[PDB]
Design a protein around this ligand. Structure first.
Ligand SMILES: CCCCCCCCCCCCCC(=O)OC[C@H](COP(=O)([O-])OCC[N+](C)(C)C)OC(=O)CCCCCCCCCCCCC
Ligand SMILES: CCCCCCCCCCCCCC(=O)OC[C@H](COP(=O)([O-])OCC[N+](C)(C)C)OC(=O)CCCCCCCCCCCCC
Lengths: 37, 50, 313, 35, 50, 311, 50, 37, 37, 37, 55, 317, 52, 307, 50, 37, 35, 37, 50, 50
């Protein structure tokens, strides 16, 4: 029963790492959208 | 009646707004008036120097 | 081929470094408002400065009529160019010690320690690195490892990146494991900051992992006056809205606050002397019709003769 | 008549919108003394 | 284990040192880094008696 | 009695004060117990005229039990009549009237209605002679069906035996209902004024088992000091020593008690209109603090006194 | 008796008059004894608006 | 039994009146003493 | 044998406080507490 | 109200006799009670 | 020795308590009076400067 | 070593104060109670005293005492005291064999030890041991009445320790502590009493106030008008509350000693000791109580004679 | 009110009797002592003047 | 009748002056008291002797708190009045018809006791003395006497002896007849006036035998023995040593008690007096002290009193 | 009889006069028989004040 | 019964008068006895 | 062993005779001072 | 029950020792105040 | 015993005779000594006169 | 115990010695410390017979 909660917290941590990586990505995407218009 | 209720309601609102205006204004009035006194003293010290 | 053109134009974007996560609501919560500064009952502060190029001063604190502030407390802090160390002794011996260390102007390492003499000792280690365009810090509250080699404590890692010279988006991650029998929980919270072009007004919104939302606005009307609004909310949902203003001068500092809970608050500090300064704080609650009044003072004096002449003139 | 958590959410939101409109107004500049 | 007893003993020692001698260590850094270097009485008395 | 009256003129005695003005310097001038409060309070009084003195005062208070939330008072004073009225929230009416038949003889009425409590009125006649002072007050006068008095009657006499001393007494007779006979209590009064008007001793032996012994002293033209000791098979007492340092800009009052408590009262006049006032009390034996703050605006009603107040 | 009812009725009337109209009588004496004789709003408002 | 209390209170009132008359008379006797000094 | 914090004890305490305060005020030390100006 | 005098009466009486005797001894009238020789 | 040690520690405790009480009493009875006296000195100095410039 | 040097520095620092040694707790009311007043000296009925001096360099004398008509004084009593430079020893024998013996011993001029013993032949023997040390600026004494130890090793008796320190060359504040344990079944009780003395600058008048552990207060004033005359007042007061105020004067001369006493209890007292001869001396004591209107009169006499021939010529001339 | 006057005479007589016997008891042995001391001083003065 | 003049008999003393030497001069029973006493007498004149005496006392049963006495004495009349607290009036009056014949009236009112008055007539002849005194005279409805009547006679049968008798007739109410008692009187004066024997056998069976003796001009002694079936008696031997500065009186009793009385005149005005009694059979002591001021009324006696 | 009532009345009068007026009669004889003849206060005061 | 007591008292008075008369005679008797020897 | 009234009569008489013998003796003159 | 009385008397003895120590301390502080005058 | 009873009887008799001799002798000795002093003063006044 | 009986016996002996022989010990100290050293009769008799 605790393994499902551990896997849920692990998925939350990996999602947080993915969102932090996407926030590091986001200046490039924002500037290229500003370059597109 | 309804007139006696409206007088009490208006008096309570006036009491709250009055003590609120006093508490939020009188320390500010003291601060601003002391700062104006300091500005006036600096102006008198500047004019007597020049 | 995103990486090389990434390095080139991200060097050409000319991004600015935002502040820390602790300095996200520094303008609204700490500068304008009075909740950090408000107290109850009488208090006197007696701090004397021995030196300035190493910043070193000892502070006595007397208080009566309050629950949070103790009766007597002696604090002393030392600050050279890169190391900040603060010690705090209390009656019934509650020791609080904070140590900052600057590895660089960007990178710092800090330790917070607290012993309450009847409560478990609470310590946290924080590493704070401010880059050119992002700011990271990692703090650990009560680090401890189980017999299996597993972490047990609180770990908060927060990141903040400016996507543009106005915005700053970021996040914080809190992983807490109390004992090891139960697996610890993880919570992710988001952070948003918007700075205006002329540095006039700052928007700041955070959505906490507990469902709580804190949205604030700071605005500078003129060089001596400032204003700010904050809104906090958290089924069982409740929230407060607080508007406040800070009118500062050379002689006095005024702070006013109106809350949505039916209370008003005032905080006035008068620098009547170059050494002595009076300070006053008042809170009126209208829904239950009572008043908390706190008064206090601050002496600052010198330790040596040179700062004694430098303090007066 | 609602008396819900949505009621106090909308109440705090309306108070926040009113305060933002009050601060960004020139009436807030009128509350600022000139000196 | 024995390493658990060792780490517990040295954490107890570190706790005792940080309890008793943190703020005197800060005051020792202060008294070392002053050009005046006052005595024990002036460093604790809040008076300006220099 | 003409030769006796000439003999009385041969003494050249002085008129002593009233029984209410016996401890006037110690209890009311030096100390702060009449003046101390708790919580915030604001006073807004405006003066309409000065040759008859007439003014209206609004009083806001919060954080205390004794002071009400809102109180409007108004007093009028011509040459020989003084009329004070006080209206309160929940309609507590307090009215006092002094009337001078002469500069010596006065008649005064006090009335209090609390809207749920029995109406309390007292009628007092006070006559000051050349060398003695008598006053008789009656609280709640009422006569039974038998023609007997029912109420409180206090008669006090004070004669100066010499231009330094003044000895006297008061007598209280109280009859509550008429079923039980009323009881009487006699209390003694002693006052000693020094020769150069420097220090005043004042001792009174109350009939309820209480004793109040007080001293007032004037160190200089700006500073004053005073001590009081009050005591009462149940006996308990307190000793309070205080000082008042007054100036043209502020009034300071400090008080040290035998009950382990200290008190301070600072009335700082910062403006010709505005005045800030502070009062603080620390009890060391149970370690708590009572803080009251407040302020007073005095303003004019007409244009002439508006220029007279500023300059 | 009838005299008891009479004295009770007139003391009740006197109590009602002294309750409702004492301080307006003092204000009427004040307004009669002023040279300016202001209106009713200025007589109650604490503002210096004259 | 209440008549004894009434008589005691009346005796207290008459004694207070007697002490009041004594405090009226005695300063004149003291002035006669002061003339003797 | 004390056996009590007697009423006479606090009577003597209040009297000693009164005598000490009168001796303090009549002393020139009370004149020293008064400023010259 | 009427109450018992019994503590306060004898205490104030002894105190007043003490104060009067101290004032009598410290007076120069006590020096007049001493013969010159 | 240990009973004398607890005696000396109780002496330190009562000394610190009495110092705290006398300190807060001296502050509460001195600081508003210090403000009053210093404001009065400033007003006297302002009157002297106005008197010397007038004469 | 270093502690002795710090103690010597502290002793010099205390010598900077220039304080004076106050008297003992027994000599706190020495002027008012024993010198001025007559309560130690008043008696009832006729009494004759016959003492003869055998020597003076050790002071030694034997005293016969005849008395009749009183309850305090016995019919016959014989006392003898010896006094060299450092030891004082008094022994008293009584009819029905009531032995009273007091012995002083001076280890120094400051530190003294004294023993008091009393056997009443039908009453329990009452003995006290007292150690009195006078320092340069304070006075300590510890007396123990009936010392005895229980089977558990616990004290059983009365122990009084008193301390008196001069805060200044005019005042002297102090206290006394009485711990009394009668049997051991009930725990012993403790009582603290306060002591206050004020000496005037020209040694003219002395105030002395003590607040006893029983709630009792004794406040006294002594004044010396001239070289031959003295006066003094005392107020002594103890659900039991009662008090007495006594004012007395002592007019002494080369030929006689007069003592007058006025009480607040409606009684007056007189005590006249007229030395009519260098050997014989007559003494009188009279007391009138006005509240119950009666009179206590005691007359008596004192012969002092010599034991040897040299003091017989030294006594007359 | 003659009986009140007679009670005043009785109280005055009793107080005068008490003060009289108190003054006699407190004055006569003192007067004998002082007069004997004056006689001794006069005897010493006569012995001093005849010697010189 | 002529041979009665040939014997050359001398007038003896009165019946009251029979034990004048032993009972009143030497002994102290008239003079002893208890507790403090003060005496204040002042002389207004001397040719008629007139003086008023104040008396203060406390601590005794016999002597009152305050007593004011005044006496007047010219050549032939004497009048003594004594007022007391609680108004006990004592008045005595002597009147001289001659130097021999005198008439006296004594009166006593105790204000709550029956008034006691006695009338006495004293005639002193060349060789005898007669006196008739009557206590409370009253006549019944039958014309009969009711009271006390004492008639006494004393004749010198020779210039050393004096024999006589007294007769007491007492009738209380008149219901019972009054009783009569005859007592005998014997006096012997020595030839050189040194010693005097004095005996009386009373009608109650009592006998009083006394002797007085004069050793020198300053010292005197005297013994008395009194006895009264239920018979008991006391033997008292005493002495009086008189001087210009003081008077000493000592007394030793057979009842186990000793007594002393010293009147020391320290001033020409002031005089101290002391009296002491010790009972050894029950071991207690009675002590009395007191004083006498005599002061003048006018200026002339004030100068005569000092010198 | 009537003579018994007469003798009882005159003995009662004689008793009253001898009770209240014996010693003032003696003092009147004394004051008549002095050459100084003092006043009433000197005749009762024990002082030598003449 | 009382008459015999009255007669006894009267006899006592007459006997006393006889003894008094004999005592008045007795100087003559004593002197003539002294003349006889 | 009699314990009668005659006992105290003889006792008082013997005391009287002894006192007469003491007074009439010159020892009573010896108890008198010469001056 | 008797333990509370024993503790109260022990507290009284310790308080007596404390006040005795304070009375020993006080003259030094008072003289150092007097030297400051 | 009997001998101790004899000592007690002798001591009681001695006590009685001692206090009797003191009471009968000491005021007489004071009187005689004062009279001797008065005679000596008269003799010294007589010799200085002649 | 046995020590209790021993201390009781020696305190009984000390009480007996202090009762019977205190004042003869004082008189022996007196007689030893005199230069004349009189006999037993002169040491107790109050007469000046020396
Ligand atoms: C344990 C240690 C305890 C220590 C005890 C601490 C006690 C400290 C409290 C002292 C209170 C300050 C008293 C005061 O008087 O301070 C004075 C200061 C003004 O100084 P100045 O330089 O400008 O004077 C210039 C004057 N001249 C222009 C004429 C020259 O003023 C100020 O500090 C501003 C104070 C604001 C008070 C107003 C409260 C309003 C309440 C509203 C409630 C409404 C009721 C419903
Ligand atoms: C075993 C027991 C034995 C018992 C024996 C006890 C013996 C007691 C002796 C006391 C009685 C004798 C007192 C006496 O003989 O007196 C005189 C005495 C000596 O005088 P002098 O010779 O030196 O003077 C000389 C002056 N010249 C030369 C002109 C005359 O002096 C004095 O003792 C002065 C003190 C007198 C006391 C007075 C007290 C006041 C009493 C009245 C109180 C009033 C209340 C109503």
């Amino acid at each position: 029963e605790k393994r499902a909660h551990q896997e849920q917290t692990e998925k939350t941590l990996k999602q947080a790492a993915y969102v932090a990586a996407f926030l590091w990505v986001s200046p490039m995407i924002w500037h290229l959208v500003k370059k597109q218009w | 009646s309804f007139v006696r209720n409206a007088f009490t309601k208006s008096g309570n609102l006036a009491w709250t707004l009055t003590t609120t205006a006093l508490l939020l204004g009188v320390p500010l009035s003291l601060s601003i008036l002391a700062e104006q006194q300091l500005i006036e003293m600096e102006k008198t010290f500047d004019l007597q120097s020049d | 081929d995103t990486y090389k053109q990434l390095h080139s134009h991200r060097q050409s974007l000319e991004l600015v470094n935002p502040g820390t996560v602790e300095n996200l609501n520094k303008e609204v919560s700490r500068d304008v408002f009075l909740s950090q500064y408000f107290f109850t009952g009488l208090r006197a502060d007696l701090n004397k400065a021995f030196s300035m190029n190493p910043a070193f001063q000892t502070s006595h604190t007397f208080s009566i009529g309050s629950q949070a502030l103790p009766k007597y407390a002696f604090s002393a802090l030392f600050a050279n160019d890169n190391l900040f160390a603060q010690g705090n002794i209390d009656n019934d011996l509650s020791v609080s010690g904070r140590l900052n260390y600057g590895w660089d102007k960007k990178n710092i390492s800090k330790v917070n320690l607290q012993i309450s003499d009847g409560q478990p000792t609470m310590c946290q280690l924080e590493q704070d690195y401010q880059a050119s365009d992002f700011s990271v810090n990692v703090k650990t509250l009560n680090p401890s490892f189980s017999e299996k080699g597993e972490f047990t404590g609180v770990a908060v890692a927060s990141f903040l990146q400016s996507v543009t010279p106005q915005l700053a988006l970021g996040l914080e991650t809190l992983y807490s494991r109390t004992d090891g029998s139960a697996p610890g929980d993880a919570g992710v919270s988001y952070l948003t900051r918007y700075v205006s072009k002329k540095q006039d007004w700052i928007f700041s919104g955070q959505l906490q992992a507990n469902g709580a939302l804190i949205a604030s606005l700071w605005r500078k009307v003129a060089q001596n006056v400032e204003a700010g609004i904050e809104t906090t909310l958290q089924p069982t949902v409740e929230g407060s809205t607080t508007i406040g203003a800070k009118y500062e001068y050379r002689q006095s500092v005024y702070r006013g606050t109106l809350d949505s809970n039916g209370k008003v608050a005032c905080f006035l500090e008068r620098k009547v002397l170059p050494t002595l300064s009076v300070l006053f704080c008042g809170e009126i609650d209208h829904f239950k019709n009572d008043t908390k009044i706190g008064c206090g003072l601050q002496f600052e004096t010198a330790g040596n003769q040179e700062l004694l002449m430098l303090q007066q003139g | 008549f609602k008396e819900s958590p949505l009621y106090t959410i909308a109440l705090n939101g309306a108070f926040f919108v009113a305060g933002v409109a009050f601060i960004q107004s020139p009436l807030m500049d009128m509350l600022a003394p000139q000196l | 284990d024995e390493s658990k007893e060792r780490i517990s003993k040295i954490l107890t020692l570190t706790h005792n040192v940080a309890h008793y001698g943190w703020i005197p260590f800060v005051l020792y850094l202060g008294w070392a880094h002053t050009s005046n270097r006052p005595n024990f009485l002036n460093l604790l008395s809040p008076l300006p008696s220099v």
